Structures are given as structure tokens and as C-alpha cells.
Amino acid sequence: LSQLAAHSTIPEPLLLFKDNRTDTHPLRGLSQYGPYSACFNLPGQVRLAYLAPTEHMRKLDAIVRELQNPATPKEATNYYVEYGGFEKVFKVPLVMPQEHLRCLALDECHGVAANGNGLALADKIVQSMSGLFRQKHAFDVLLVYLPASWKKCFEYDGFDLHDRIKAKVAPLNLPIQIINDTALTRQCRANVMWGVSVALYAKAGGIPWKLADWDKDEAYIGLSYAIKKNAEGQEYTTCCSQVFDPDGTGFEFVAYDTRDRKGNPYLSYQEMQSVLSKSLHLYQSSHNGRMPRKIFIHKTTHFTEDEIQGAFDSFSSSTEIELVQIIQSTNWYGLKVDPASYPVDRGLYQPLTESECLLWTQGSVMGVNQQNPGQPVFKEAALTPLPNPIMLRRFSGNGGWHATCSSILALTKVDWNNNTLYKKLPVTLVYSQVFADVVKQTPEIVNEIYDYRFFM
Amino acid sequence: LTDNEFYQHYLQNSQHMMWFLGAGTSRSAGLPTASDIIWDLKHRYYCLHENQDYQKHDINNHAIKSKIQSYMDSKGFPLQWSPEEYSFYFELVFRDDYEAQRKYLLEALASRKVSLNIGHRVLAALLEMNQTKVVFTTNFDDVIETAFSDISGKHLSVYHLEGSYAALSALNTEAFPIYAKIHGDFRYQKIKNLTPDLQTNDREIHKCFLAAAIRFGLVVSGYSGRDENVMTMLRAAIDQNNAFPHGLYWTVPSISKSEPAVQDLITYAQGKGVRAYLVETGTFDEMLSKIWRQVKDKPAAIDAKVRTARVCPVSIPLPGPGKPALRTNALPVVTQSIRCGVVTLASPITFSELKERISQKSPKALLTYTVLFLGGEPEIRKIFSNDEINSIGQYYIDEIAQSVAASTFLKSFVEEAILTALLREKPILHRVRHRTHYAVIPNASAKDDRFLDLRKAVGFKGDLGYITGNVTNAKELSWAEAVSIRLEERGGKLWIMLKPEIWIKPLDRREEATDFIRSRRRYRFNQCSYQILDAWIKILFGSIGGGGTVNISCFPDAEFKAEFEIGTRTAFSLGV
Amino acid sequence: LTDNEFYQHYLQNSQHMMWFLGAGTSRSAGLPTASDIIWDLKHRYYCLHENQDYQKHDINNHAIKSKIQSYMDSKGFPLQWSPEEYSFYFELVFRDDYEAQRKYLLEALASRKVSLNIGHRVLAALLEMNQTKVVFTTNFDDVIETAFSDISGKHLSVYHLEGSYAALSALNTEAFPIYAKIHGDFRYQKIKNLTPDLQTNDREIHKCFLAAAIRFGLVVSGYSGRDENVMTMLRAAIDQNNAFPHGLYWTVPSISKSEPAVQDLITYAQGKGVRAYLVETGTFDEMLSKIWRQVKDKPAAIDAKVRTARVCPVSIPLPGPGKPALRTNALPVVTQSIRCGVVTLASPITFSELKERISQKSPKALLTYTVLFLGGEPEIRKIFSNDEINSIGQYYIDEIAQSVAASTFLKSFVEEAILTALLREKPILHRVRHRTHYAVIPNASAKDDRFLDLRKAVGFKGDLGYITGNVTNAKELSWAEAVSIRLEERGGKLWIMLKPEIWIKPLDRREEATDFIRSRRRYRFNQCSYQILDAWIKILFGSIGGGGTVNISCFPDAEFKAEFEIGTRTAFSLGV
Amino acid sequence: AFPIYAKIHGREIHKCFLAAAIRFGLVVSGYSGRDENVMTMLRAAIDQNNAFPHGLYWTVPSISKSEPAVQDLITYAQGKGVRAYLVETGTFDEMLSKI
RNA sequence: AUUCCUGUUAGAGCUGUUAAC
DNA sequence: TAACAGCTCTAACAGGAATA
RNA sequence: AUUCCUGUUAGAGCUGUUAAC
DNA sequence: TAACAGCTCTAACAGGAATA
Ligand SMILES: Nc1ncnc2c1ncn2[C@@H]1O[C@H](COP(=O)(O)O)[C@@H](O)[C@H]1O
Ligand SMILES: Nc1ncnc2c1ncn2[C@@H]1O[C@H](COP(=O)(O)O)[C@@H](O)[C@H]1O
Ligand SMILES: [Mg+2]
């Protein structure tokens, strides 16, 4: 009775890179081959701009210089790869801004920060951008710096400065790479350089890497929510992200609102149907009208009867729907035996119940070790000694745990904002949660949809 | 009239209810509306003369919609969503070619884009299970026909303008259910959709509606007036003896946005003696969902198709353990049936009241409410006097897993019982944090031989480790090894969850040792965690995890005793 | 044309195939045929004027039929099953009242007596899965309208004479599937069933038959001819260019009883250059059953409704063993997976050939064909030389129960293996009678201590019994106690069946001791049989039937060894 | 088993043209007639009960420049009840581009 | 906020099970 | 609607860095 | 054949699994 | 279509009588 169903370890998903080469290590492949989207010239050159107070601009130009020159990894050398220099590794020059492409924040921002007013501080930071907006064509990415003296307005109740800035500059189409003092004072340098460089390339152009072995006929959907603590009650702001590989070479990753008020994170019949309608209409527009054949709707909470009925009735019979729920905190945890020195291989899925499975999005990864090749690497070794798996509670499917598990595993590796090897959750869930935070901070965003490069 | 009272009225008399659904239900069936048809026609018209690529620019874009509407207004056409526009654009595009008009209207509303939702399926179920007999519609596409064919499995008799008089006879001979389209199927020559055709009514269909008025009461949904012929037919139906035996219930998604024609017709009907009421019940789909919810004794065969989510999908079986194998922390509890004690109270009791009685009396027994008690009767007599106790009997839990899954009170009770059993005869202390239970090595008895293996588990490079002590930089915080033990219901099985933790003697001062808890747990890798879990299994069970079926009973010296049996080996499964 | 060649031709090209079902197919749907309708009309007519009780005398009685027909002949009416009779009796009973005639024809052919059989369901599946697009019918009842609604779950577009031009438009715009009734639904006013109405054809429908003639080839079933209008429409369809691209396949249940009109039409069609063929395929139901059988890649969703017997019903679960308990003779074999040896032969081998090789060589191993061998490789080398052996490898039987259930060779092989294992290390002799294996106490070693308990089992009033010996009145027959041991596959489990028997040393001379076998077994009542079964369990297993899991391996000293484990306690279940 | 591209080279196409005329309508471009074989081919295709159900469309760059036989055939088809039409468009390639 | 998710402290949201109103 | 049980989530902080 | 079904001796019928034809 | 495996049945006989 102690013998469970046999598991199968899904191998490490391959990532499409420069010249359609595949390598499961993102940074190693980027150094070796280059970005997938560099095959075409979406970014001609990464022209930057600075927005910071006059005192701390030297930090911005210093960090840009550090991006220009190669760096070596000091911490987590088990996984990271030596930086080859932005021009060498992304095959595109990184242009330092000239005098007019380099703005100065108003001194009134300091007064507002001393006053402890987050809303007015974000408004003033945005209003400082007019000098660059007269030259919006000149630059591609704006590096907004915030001095530590503004910490009092960085994060407090009912507010978040980063989300407010992102929601204020998203309709203005300019990507923004916010830099705090943390990126400056992080012990290691190759960490910050790799993260900032991949973010800069994604926000100026896009697609640093693309997941291979992706059927063009599947659209993956992830719903996630956030809470705004009202004085009387609460507001549950839920938003949905969508990923798919279209007929064109440009892999698409978008997010959107879901509309009024919600008291619970469970969508009703009409709201679920409307969101799903918007989703497959977006897919059809990106697929010249072709119907999706596989749909994956990942939700952090269980689908009610209304949500499943809305899913069933929104599509036609030809498009099978894979309604799956992702559980983050679970009691179970495993230990590999042959007992192994390193924890269980990443990607092992263990069918517990006919509808509930354990997926090991965390765990040892093979073939991505730089030093002592052949040794396994545990991404979260610093944080945890063992990997905590997630629970997939399939609410609607025809058959095959492998089909959804491999899709989730491949969706855990295409977060360009993530410096590390993978993510505990699929990019759909994480982007839906990020956009949920953004919408909760700024409710007047429900009108439009946005690409990933805006909010990553 | 409030919506809930309307629902109660409809449920009270649902056997005599005509439905009237014109162009409002089709919005939610996946097929284009009137405005969508108008915009599609404008798109074709603009792309045709002004030579522009049809697929290059879409139709639901705001810019393209504005440009096409500006072009239409340039040639003097009607301005915006105004009467005599839909028919105008039809007669403009198709220049009086009713065959081509019919073919286009068939293609736009064809039976391939339609995906039945809950509303049409629920109405078709009402038709089949024979509550509503007549469903009049001003709508062309076969949404209700497809829903009835999908649910009932029987062919539905649709009536139209070709035959025309066919419906009246069916009414007279009670050939229910009848689904008479006042404007007929698009599969036939006459469609009656343009404004000039919308001023007249077919004589036989008019007579059929007038006759059906006396027999049933009407519920009209997804209809916003704007049609003169249907409005005058309804007005004529009102102007006759006992026009509606069950009242005309006009439902709109929003009372505020309802056209004044509907309101004045309702006032006229009320002035003519009928009890016609206008209610708002939200969308048609939600209305029909609620109506089906209030339906009693719905057949299972049709309800398996009405609500496909109600049946449980994805019952995908799991394979065998054939052919590296992860070793989880789950100990399977193979106990299937247990015995408990029940006390009957002369007055109703609350689970909170029993919890506070537990807190005050502190008996040597367990109790929960559902009052099921595990232990000795005299303890319950201490808790409850003879006056409040009526009788004390026995309870049998034939299926433990189903019982704990059904009621969370049973889950908590069985978890507490198994925890008490596991720590009944052992020196390991039993504490609780939040709603979880912790078995922690005691401070005084830390030098026991049964802990020595645990001492080996935490040891560095094979030397002797430490099990209990004081934090390196804390004033009074004391720390020990511990295991969080929980009950997990998985499918049809129960398992015991063990997780190694670092217990802190002060409950509220755990965070001050966080770094220490981190520092002690930095290097508890797979081998070390395997060793600690094996040591904890040995401590909690007394037998190594090979082929063991150790059985533990709680309160063995009590009349009501629970005897569980948990396999000493944690869950494992070799890879395929 | 032979029926099989017709099936291959249809199967070869079923994509483009109109069907022309007549009133013969509805014969099975349970609807009254033409003759049944005539006899019903005669019954009403006779009972009406001659005042006789309607329900007192039935209609399918031979005497009442003869009496009514004699009465009809008395008034000069047509004699017997002759033309212009069906219409004659209709026009006589209903005296030119087409509304009442329609109502009666609706009531007789109503949609409550119809129970769809395999033929209509298979045709509706062909319609939905889109092989046949046009199904013409001269038949009124919705025998096929209902089947499509039940199978597809979608509304079917039925065409009739009320519109009658819908078919040509739907054909022209490829709105398949179309089901055009050449004589229209009975719901509508025009039915076109009397002989005067059967001389003319609707212009638009007639037009459709010719346009559809060019597109597809026709298969007409359940049509006997006798209709002038349909015959002349078919003849006109023949007299046009490439009249049938796939030939007119006229099918009759019997070629001998086919009317000469069909044969002369076939000859005329052949003379007009088309490949029309007349075949006999039995009844319509059998024809469509075979056609569906030859259909490839039929969707599971619709096939679950086409053949409801194909899905497995009555999967009624069994309850728990909760709460007198019968003790059967079944020992559960909990072994799930075993290992076997496979030899690859350079030339094909027959199971009979392997059996005779076993008989000649007599090796110390087991073999079966599927060649799976259990034992030592050198034994197989003795059986098969190196020249005929290509390779020797391993085989794993992950699911033993499913494997034995699927292949009876596996059942016999596993039964022989478990029998050899059980008698490997024990003195009890192993024999076979028919195909049943017997474990019998040996003659010489009958005084063993392990048999003493068995000696107690057969003893009378608790004394010492006898286990082996000679018959009371037989010249040379010797008798012994024995147990027939068999393998039984029950559901998803395997069990060992033990039955106490009286083995006779001469195989063919068992009957001469029958009385003795009876006499020894006269008083082997429940207690005595319980004792003998317990003693045999102890002998065969070495452990008493309490909480035991004895494991036995066959050929333990061999590379390929099978290790089974059978619970020592027989099956039991307490009453509910 | 569509699509097919059959060249008249003007009886093996006669039956094919007849069946095709039964099936779906025809549009003819780049042809002025002037050939009696195809003329009788099309005239024989017209007679059947459902011939060119969608319609026959003789498209020429200029209506007045077309040969009289084409207009005669169009009038004959219209009299027979078929929905044949003579529409004036541009060059065949320009017509197909606009389509 | 270059990143990652490990914990702490809280509240909700769903399910339920009773008592009602 | 008021408690109570469990399962799971986010909301604020804090926080150190890949088997030693 | 007042009954009952316990055995003996045989053959078929279905399923299969191979080899074909 | 020819064997082979099991599961189950009937077709002819024979045959003795309800825990002793
Ligand atoms: N989901 C719905 N449920 C009920 N009624 C609806 C729905 N959607 C639209 N309607 C009504 O249908 C009307 C439009 O029908 P018409 O414009 O006459 O074709 C609107 O005025 C709405 O009141
Ligand atoms: N199994 C069958 N299915 C359909 N039609 C049949 C069947 N057996 C016979 N028929 C035909 O049914 C016809 C009788 O129709 P009717 O002339 O209306 O009585 C005869 O011509 C038979 O050939
Ligand atoms: Mg960023």
C-alpha cells in the first residue's frame, strides 16, 4: 500500500536561441549563441536614457559602464556564466545616452518624499519625463533610479511605487527599467549585470530566448488575483495573462484585466466567459482566425462550477480545454534515492489521486553545471535545503498528465525578468499576479492589454 | 416586482409557461447580434467599392469602425444606431436579392460557430422534462433546436413561416413541445427580417399565439421591443378574455435601460386586468441558471448534459509502481473503521461551547461535535452532568477517509486522536502551533538512547550532534528538534505527514531565532534530511521503515478506544 | 452483384452516397407498416358500423382478421393485398377529410412508440460523421430525425413538401446533411400518401433529385417499388449525363421476392450507361450493422450511442465486508508481476509442436507459446538446439490478472507454474485428469505426520480415519484423498481453487468406484468438509489459515524463477 | 478529389462539363465564344433541371465589344430560367486581383 | 525595485457542520 | 447570519546567496 | 416418464493465440 | 481455416433418497 504510481521525470525543456539553436541553460546559451530575436532586427540598437536626481546620476552611468564591460560571477558560481560584454553576448551595441537623452528629477520629488506621499512622488517622477518625451524616438529604454532617501515612499499600506510608475508609463509606451540601490550594493556583480542586461534587451525589442518544442495550436492562460484592503471590506482584483507561439516567429506574452467589483477571487459565469472570449479572440487575431486546439487555464485557486461551465460553453467542441489548478503550499515533500546527495531531479511529477498530482518545479537540474560538469545543481539551495513541490489539481481534462506537466515545466523557464534558471510557478501565473498588483494599485488600466516587456 | 418573488412565482406554476426569446439569447450563444451583423455588412460594403483588403483591417477595431461609419455617413446613409438601419444596410448590400440575402444570413448565423451555454441548454431541458410547452422566438438560428437535440436526444419540432399553420394545429392537438419561430428558419425562402416585412404578422401564427395566450402565461426574455408587429400581436393577445392565466412576466437585463415601449405595454396590460409584471433578473443565462437551480427532481440523464461541470471529469487512472524512487513523508493509515462514543444532550450545544468546556475542565478524553467522544465515560460525566446527558451510546465510522473528507470536524477529531495515540506512551512532548501538532524532543530527557540515532542524524561529518539546547544569541529562547505531524486526506486514503522542524520553547518568540533556524537548516540536504526523517520514523514508531505494520491505540484502558494501524514505511514509487 | 463486393464498393466510396430509405425500414422502428395501417383502418371501420366492442377482439388474431376481411369483401371492397387498397381504405374511413386523416396518421406513427434500432442509429451516425450527405425518404415518421438528435446531439434539418424548395437551396449551398422527405412530415397539411396524390411529383423536390443525382451515387434500401411518381423521377434522373457517378445500388431483403419493376428499372439504367446494380444484403438493420462494422476511425463519442451494448453497463460496485460468514475455497494470489524467459526461433513454431516436444524430451522446465519458458536455460537447450534458437531474453508480466484473462495460453501457463510451485517441495503427488490438476496423497508415504490432521478430518466421531487404500469391491482400483487445484480469474484478481476429491489410481477406471466415491462422500457435511479443507490448506501451505502470507517459488535454483505469494486464509465475508 | 485543371483542347470532357454544370455555377473569362464545339457543349449543359444553380457569368473587358453569340447564349439561358448574366469587368488578371 | 522564494506576523476567501432567523 | 473545523491565498516585512 | 441433481463417459459451442490461405 | 488454451453447455447413462 506504500507503493505509489510510477513517476516519470520530464527532461529539461529546450530553449530556442540565435539561429534556432536549442540549449536548456539560458545564460550559457545567450553567451554561446545569442538571443533568439536577434535573428531579425527588432532592436536596431539599445539606446538608453536616465532619470534620476542630479546627485545619484553617477551611479547610473557607472552601472551602465559595468553593463558595457564583462564581469565574472562571485556568488552562485555553480550556475552562472561569465559575462561576455553586452555587445558580444547580445550582438547589439548598447548606446550610452548623450546630454539631452539624460534627464534630472525635479527637486520637488525630494520634498514630496520627505512628506511621505507616494502618489505625488510617482506623479512627480512621471512628470519629470517630459524632457525625454520630446525625444521619445531617440531612446528605447529609460533607466529610472530612485535614491535610498525615498525609501519612506517605496512601499507602504495601500500603495506601491513601482506598480504605480509602471501603470503610469505603460500607456506612454516607453519601457522603464527601475534601478534601486540594491542592484548597486549587491555583493556579486555578474548577477546584477546578467539580470539587468537581459531585462534591457527584452524591454528594447524583445524575446531574449524562446521555448522550443512549442505547438503553435495551444494557448496557455493563467489567472491570478490581488487584494485591495478597503476601509469597509475588500476588493479582489483578478487579471489574466496569456502566452502562445503564433504563426509568426514572435512568441507572444500578454496580460489583461477582467471587465466590476469582486468580493471573492472566483469568477462568475459571465466574467469567466467574457475573459475566455477575449483570450481566444486575441489568439484568433494572432492566428489569422484559426481556432486554438488546446487551452490551458492555470488558476491559483480552485475552479467553481460556474468557472468550469463558462470554460465549457465559451469554446466549441473541437477545442479541448485543460482546466488545471496550481497549489503552491503543500504538505508533501520528497527525497530522491538510488539516498542521493542532491534532491530529486527537477520536473518529476507524481500522480497521487486521479485528479491531483505533485509537480517538482523545484529540484536538481542536470546538464547546466559550469564547474565540475555532471554535478547536479539546486537553484534554491540557499533558500531551502529541500524542494517544495506544487500540487496540480486538474479540474477538466481528457487524458495525459505528461501533456500538462511538460507545458508547465516549459512555462516555468521563459521568465526573462527572472535572472535564475527557472521559476516555481509558470510565467502565466507570475505575470497575472504582477498585472494584478498593477491593476490593484491603478484601477484605471482595465481598458487595455499589455505585452510582458512593459511590466517585467 | 423583485426578481426573487418572480422566481418563486415561476417555480410555483412552471407547468404552464410559454417562453418568448427574440434575438437576445443569441447574443450569448456565440453568434453575432444585430449590431454585429450591421457592422459586418458595413465592412463588406466599404471594402467592396473602395477597394481595400478585407482581412488587412478587422471589424471590432475602434479606428476601423469609426472610419467605416464616417464613410457610410459620407454617402448620406443613416447616422448611427437608429431605426430603419439594419434593414436599410441589408437592402443596400443585397439590392433586393432575397436568395443571396438568405444565404448570407445563413452563413453568418450558421450552425458551426454556435456553442450552447447554460441558458439554452436549461431551456431545452425545461422543454424536454415538460414544464414549458411553447417557446416562441423572433430568432432565426437553431440554438434551441441544437440544445434540445443535444440534451434530449430527440428531434425537436420547429415551426416557421413556410408551413405557417402547422404550429396552430400542434397547439390544438397538444403535440408539445412546440418551438414556433415567428420569423422562421433561414433555411427557407421567407425570413421576414427587413423592416417592410416586420410590419405584418402571419395570420395563422397570429391565431396560434392568441390561442396559446389563454392556455399558458408568458415569460419573455432577451426582447427589447422595437418590433411593431410583435408588439401589436401581444397587445391583441392582451385584449381578450382571461388573456394570461399566469401573467406576462417581461424580463430585462436592466430595468433602467428598458425601452419605454415595454413599460407602456406593461401599463396597458395592467389596465386590461392581467397581472403582467416587469422584472429585472440580469442576463438570460443567469436567469435560466437560477430557474434550473430551483427545479426539483430533475432527471439525472438530462442533467448530465445540462450541467457538464456537475459530473466529475478527469478521472484519469494512475499506473502501477513498476520499474530512482522518491521517498515522501507520508505514512499510510490503513485503518478503515473505528469506534467512537456519542452523548445525547437535553439542550442544543455549540462546538465553541464544547471547546470552552474542554479548556475549563481539561479532561483525559477527546470530544468533537457533529457529540462524538473518544475515551472514558467518567471523563464525560466530569464534563457533562447527568442532568444534561440523556444517553451515551456507540458510533461506528465504516469509511474513515470519506468521513474526514466530508466533515472537517471529523478531520480535526481524527487528527487529534492519532496524535494522542502516537504520543501516548512516548517521552516526546506534544505541543501545538496555530492549528498544527508538533512532537518535540523534551529538554530534560534529551540524553535518552532512543534519541541517539536522531543525534546521529544532525551530527556533522558523522560525529555526535545536538538535539536540544539554547540559541546562540538569545536571552531565554530554547530550541529543540521536532516534527510537525498532520493528517492528509488523499483520494480515498489517509496519510500521516511528518515534517522536521526546529521547535522554539517560547511560542511567540520564534522569529528572534529565525537566523538560527535558518543557520541550523542551511545544510540539511537530501542525505541529512533522509537521516532525520528515518530517525523520526524510528522514534515515533519504534520500528525501522521496512515491512512494518505497527498498530497504535489511544486510551487502551478506556471503553471507547480507537485502534489505528499505520505502515512504518513512507510512501515510495519507482520511476517508469 | 454479390453483397460482399457491394460492401467493398460502398466502403471504397461512401463519402458520396445518397440514401433512399423507403417505408420498409420503419417496419422495425416499431411503427405500423402499410399493411398494419390498412388492418387498423379496417378494424376501426368494421367496429364502427357493425357495433362491436373495439378492445374485446384484437387485430393480429387470424380469426378476427379473416372475419373483418370477409366483411370488407361483403360490401364489394377490394379483395386482398392489391393496389389502390391502402388509399382506398383511407379515403373510405375518412371520407375526404385530410385534416382528420393527417391527425390519425400522426397518432399511428407518433413519436412515442418509436424505439430506434441499430439501422437508423447507424445511418444517423453516417450523416453526422459526414459520409452520406443526402437521405431521401418517402416516409413520414421521424424515425431518422430522432436518431440523429439522439446520437449527434444536434438538430437535424428535415425537408418536406411544406416548403419543398429548401432542399434545392441547401443542396446548392452545400448545407449538408439534408434529409428531404419526398412525401413530407405528417405534422404539415400536405402528406401526399393517397394514390391520387402519388401520381405527381413536387417540381422543386423532383428538381433536387436530378441535381443530387450528378453529385452522388444512390443506395436505395427498404423500397419495394409500386410508386409511379418516385419510379418516374428515378428514370428521369437516369436519363441525364453522368446520371450516377457511383452507380445506383438497389438493395432488397430478397432478390427472389423483388418486384419486376425494380429489375426492369435496373436493366433500363444499365442500358443508359450507368453501373446500377441490384444486390441482396438481408434486412436493412443487418446491412447497416455490417456497413458500420466496416467503418474505420468512427468517433468514440458518437459510437458510444450507436452501439450502446459496446460500452460495458452494470458496473455496480460491491459493498464493504462490514458486520455468519461463508468461507469459500479461494486463496487469493496477491502476486502482481512475474518474470519469464523468452526464446526466439529461426522458424515459426506451433503450440502443438512445442507440446509434442515437451512430451518427447520431458524437460525439467515449463514452456508455452504466445515462446515463454519458466525454468533453466540448459533445459531449453535440450529442447531446442542452438541452430533453431536465435536469442534468449526476459519477459515481465506487469499485470498477471489482465494477462491471464486476455490470453488463455497465459492462464494455462500460470496455472501449471503455480501448481508446480505448490507441489515442488512436498511429498504429495501431482496428477492431471482432463485439464484439471490434482494433488493426491501418495500411497507409500500415507503414514506421514503431515497427513495426520487429514486423518483426523476424515475420521468418524473423532477417531482416526483413512487417507489411502483400496476400494471395498474392486479388483485393482486404488483410492486416495486428493484436491483439485485450479486458477480462477475473478475481476482483477487471481485465486486458487481447492476442491476435495477422491482420486482413483487407474485414470480410466474411476467410474467402477463411483458408489464408493459416493459412499465415502455421503456424510461429508459442512463440518467435515470444513475440516478437510483446513487440513488440505495446512498440507499445501504449511501454515494455518490465520494472517498468513506464505510465498512459494518454482525452480528457486533456476535463473528464470517465478515467485508467487498466496494468502493462506480462504476468502470470507461477514453478512450485512 | 479536387482540385482539377482540365483543358478542353477544342466528348470525354462533354460528360465532365455536364456533371460539373450540374454541381456548381460557372464564370467564364478571356473567352469570346466563336467556337461551335464549346458553344454546343455549354448549351447542352444548360438544359438539365438544375444547371449552373449559382449562376453563369460571362465576363468580358467591355460589354459592347463582345461577340453576338455570347449575348445570344446569355439571352437563351435567361429565357430557359437559368440565372446567367453578362457583367462588364476589366482585364481577367485585374478582375482576379480585385476578387 | 537586476533576481530568487525561504520564513515570520496577520487577515481574508472558499468549502463545510451546527444553531438559528 | 453567528460561530466552529480545514485548505489555500495574499498582504507586509526580513533576508541571504546555490553540498558547504 | 411423480420427482431431485449427484457423478461418469463424450462432443460441440463460443471466446481467444498463432500459422496460414 | 488448422491447430492449440480455457469456460460452459447439452447428450446419454447410472442412480440413490435428506446429519446419518
Ligand atoms: N444576455 C441577455 N439576456 C437577456 N436579454 C438580453 C441579453 N442580451 C441582450 N438582451 C436584450 O436583447 C435586446 C436586443 O434585441 P434586438 O436588438 O431586438 O435584436 C437588448 O435590448 C437586450 O435588452
Ligand atoms: N427489413 C426491411 N427493412 C426495410 N424494408 C423492408 C424490409 N423487409 C422488406 N422490406 C420492404 O418493405 C416493402 C413494403 O412496403 P409497403 O409497400 O409500404 O408495404 C417491401 O417492398 C419490402 O421489400
Ligand atoms: Mg525589471
Description:
This is part of a larger assembly, with 1 copy of chain A (456 residues) and 3 copies of chain B. With 456 residues, chain A is an alpha/beta fold. Chain A has a domain at 8-12 and 211-454: Ribonuclease H-like superfamily/Ribonuclease H (Nucleotidyltransferase, domain 5, 2-Layer Sandwich). Chain A has 14 helices and 20 strands. In chain A, helix 11 links the parallel strand 13 (294-299) and strand 14 (320-327). In chain A, helix 5 packs parallel to helix 7, helix 7 packs across helix 13 and helix 10 runs parallel beside helix 11 (305-314). Chain A is globular and about 70 Å long. The termini of chain A are far apart. The two termini of chain B are 64 Å apart. Classes of the chains: A alpha/beta (456), B alpha/beta (576). Chains in contact: A-B, B-C, C-D. The structure holds adenosine monophosphate (2 copies) and magnesium ion (MG). Magnesium ion binds next to loops of chain A. Chain A binds 4 DNA and RNA strands through strand 7, helix 7, helix 9, strand 10 and strand 18.
Strands of chain B, total number: 21
Output the CATH topology of the domain at 8-12 and 211-454 in chain A. Nucleotidyltransferase, domain 5
| Overall geometry of chain A | globular
Strand content of chain B: 15-25%
SS summary, helix count of chain A: 14
Instruction: Report the count of strand segments of chain A.
Output: 20
PDB class: structural protein/rna/dna
Keywords: RNA binding protein, structural protein, STRUCTURAL PROTEIN-RNA-DNA complex
Entry title: Cryo-EM structure of the tetrameric SPARSA gRNA-ssDNA-NAD+ complex
Chain A: Piwi domain protein
